[PDB]
Amino acid sequence: ASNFTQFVLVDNGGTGDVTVAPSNFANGVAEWISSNSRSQAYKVTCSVRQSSAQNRKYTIKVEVPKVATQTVGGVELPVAAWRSYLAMELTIPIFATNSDCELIVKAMQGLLKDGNPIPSAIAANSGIY
């Protein structure tokens, strides 16, 4: 097919959407970044390897910029204060069929669906209670 295309990472309904696009493919590690300074950009990387005899493993990483009081194109230090890092590791047994995998994706979509426990906690600087 060729899935390495640009896509919408943050959907604000047309107005203010954040689109991320192909920016690197060194070592099979695909990368997408928004149209920003790399210090203030949205970054997404993803790769697959066979972690072991009977397991394959996808490693996905996301970097999201702190936007409140942000200064576009400015030098903001320390970097750790202005960025959030997401690191996902997905282990899938070599026996999983496409169907099995489709389900695994659905579970991930469900986990983060709007209004569910986890996404709500995160969106409110909260934990579970």
Partner RNA sequence: AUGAGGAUUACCCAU
Partner RNA sequence: UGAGGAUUACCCA
- The torsion defined by the Cα of 118, 122, 125 and 129, in degrees rounded to 10, comes to 0
Site for RNA, rule CB under 7 A: 26-29, 43, 45-47, 49, 51-55, 57, 59-61, 63, 83, 85, 87, 89, 91
Shortest distance, position 15 Cβ to a second copy, whole Å: 14
Check binding of 5 to a second copy (CB under 8 A). Answer: yes
Ranges within 108-127 binding a second copy (CB under 8 A): 108-114, 116-127
Question: Cα(129)–Cα(124) distance, rounded to whole angstroms?
Answer: 12
Q: Which does 15 bind (CB under 5 to 8 A by kind): a second copy, RNA, none?
A: none
How, if at all, do strands 7-10 and 55-65 pair? unpaired
Check binding of 12 to a second copy (CB under 8 A). Answer: yes
Q: How many CB atoms lie within 10 A of CB 29?
A: 13
Which residue, 14 or 60, has its beta carbon nearer to RNA? Answer: 60
Shortest distance, position 117 Cβ to RNA, whole Å: 12
Judged on CB neighbours under 10 Å (0-12, 13-18, 19+), 68 is exposed
Q: Which does 51 bind (CB under 5 to 8 A by kind): a second copy, RNA, none?
A: RNA
Ranges within 27-86 binding a second copy (CB under 8 A): 27-28, 30-33, 35-39, 41-42, 44, 46-50, 53-56, 58, 60, 62, 64, 66-86
Q: Which residues have CB under 8 Å from 99's CB, separation 6+?
A: none
